Write a protein that binds this ligand. Sequence first.
Ligand SMILES: O=C(N[C@H]1CCCN(c2cc(-c3ccncc3)n[nH]2)C1)c1cc2ccccc2[nH]1
Ligand SMILES: C[S@@+](CC[C@H](N)C(=O)[O-])C[C@H]1O[C@@H](n2cnc3c(N)ncnc32)[C@H](O)[C@@H]1O
Lengths: 237, 245
Amino acid sequence: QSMLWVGVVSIFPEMFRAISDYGITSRAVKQGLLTLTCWNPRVYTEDRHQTVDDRPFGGGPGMVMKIKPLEGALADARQAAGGRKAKVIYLSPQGRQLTQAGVRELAEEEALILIAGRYEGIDERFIEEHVDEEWSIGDYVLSGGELPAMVLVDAVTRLLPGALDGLLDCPHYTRPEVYADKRVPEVLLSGNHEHIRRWRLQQALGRTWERRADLLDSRSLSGEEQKLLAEYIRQRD
Amino acid sequence: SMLWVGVVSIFPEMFRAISDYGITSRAVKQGLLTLTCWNPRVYTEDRHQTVDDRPFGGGPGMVMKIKPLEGALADARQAAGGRKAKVIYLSPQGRQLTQAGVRELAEEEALILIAGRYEGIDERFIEEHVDEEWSIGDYVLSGGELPAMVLVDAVTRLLPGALDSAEEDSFTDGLLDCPHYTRPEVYADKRVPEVLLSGNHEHIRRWRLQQALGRTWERRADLLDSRSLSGEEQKLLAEYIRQRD
Ligand SMILES: O=C(N[C@H]1CCCN(c2cc(-c3ccncc3)n[nH]2)C1)c1cc2ccccc2[nH]1
Ligand SMILES: C[S@@+](CC[C@H](N)C(=O)[O-])C[C@H]1O[C@@H](n2cnc3c(N)ncnc32)[C@H](O)[C@@H]1O
């Protein structure tokens, strides 16, 4: 049926309209490249206002997500994935940092179940028991895992065949040619493909070196790349 | 309001994800947070003009034109009124967002966030109008709307009276967080550590600090290279490593 099956465990399934109703994610859902389902732990509660948080053992601020509701939603999602190999990922700052390399890897999966936490987190025993991998979108703290989940799905969905390198991007220009006495680089106005390719590559290399030299220390460069970057540096004020 | 945020995006209605749900929503209600959106497609020259156009020199995709973005930003700037607004473009070429960066961003009176789409925005717009470029991580998304929402969420957490606790979470003390436990005492033949059931407040503090240190050491030793260890922290971490088994 679909290339990527995603099940999201979240108490705010309504938030995932941002990727289901918009962009390539929406387009992939309609094309059937991407199957997106939501599983509200709040529905697998058996009480008052469908409470899914409790007070933490040992005290402290905040609340913790109870096991029982989470258990429900995850069991349902696992069933819903069928005979697909589903990786269960918890979105948390304690997880492995998401990078483009990590995204390419994640795009090879046939099914993902994403747990979005709220409050202080979920019970460590749930994680021990049910979670295959922990992923972080960066070294900052968000109020929940819904946005991280959606970030992950967006990045991964981009790489799916028929949806649409360690360098930063070149600058981009479009109409008009001149705007408030700021003209577009001449090289992009000459129809020459080879000059344009060389200039963009060099600008990419230059910006990478200027702002993210760490990306250059990981990736070894081609001979042409070394020359173009050298020329960039030596010809800059 | 304490924080005024204006978002420049061609999908303003996508921001219902933070305006209608979670602490961002309740911060808006409470009046800590003002959230506004500005669709550049409504600021074009005429209504037969798209916000995007073909990239000069070719290449895949389209680029966002400067005229629409310039209009929307003028409107947002005007709306922010007396406030010092910082104009942020969400880009992979930006500064890496970290919790330190978030604390700093939460001291601003007003933020105007430009969410690009397609290949990006015209470089001349950035050159002229953008104060700061921020990246939420080293990966490529289809647009800046989710990055913008990430930024607003993180910042809104630090607004006095928004909420867990903002001064006890991960990255605050340079460490990862400890594990958390709640009812029941035993689940799937796994018990809550006794320290959290019977222990005093000193035992629990020391236990949580040790777990923090241990998890950081296991998963994120790079964090420990930047923040030094004290004598007590080295002993607690040594003990963690030797009792890992
Ligand atoms: O990089 C692209 N688009 C960007 C343009 C500027 C704003 N968008 C964005 C922001 C981010 C981002 C922001 C903050 N932190 C991490 C990523 N990723 N992508 C979308 C891009 C889209 C695209 C489509 C086909 C071929 C090449 C392509 N490149
Ligand atoms: C506010 S957090 C608290 C997490 C935990 N107490 C800590 O500080 O490490 C609650 C939820 O937000 C989500 N979250 C926060 N920051 C995240 C990030 N950088 N990446 C992925 N998920 C995140 C997690 O799903 C987490 O369960």
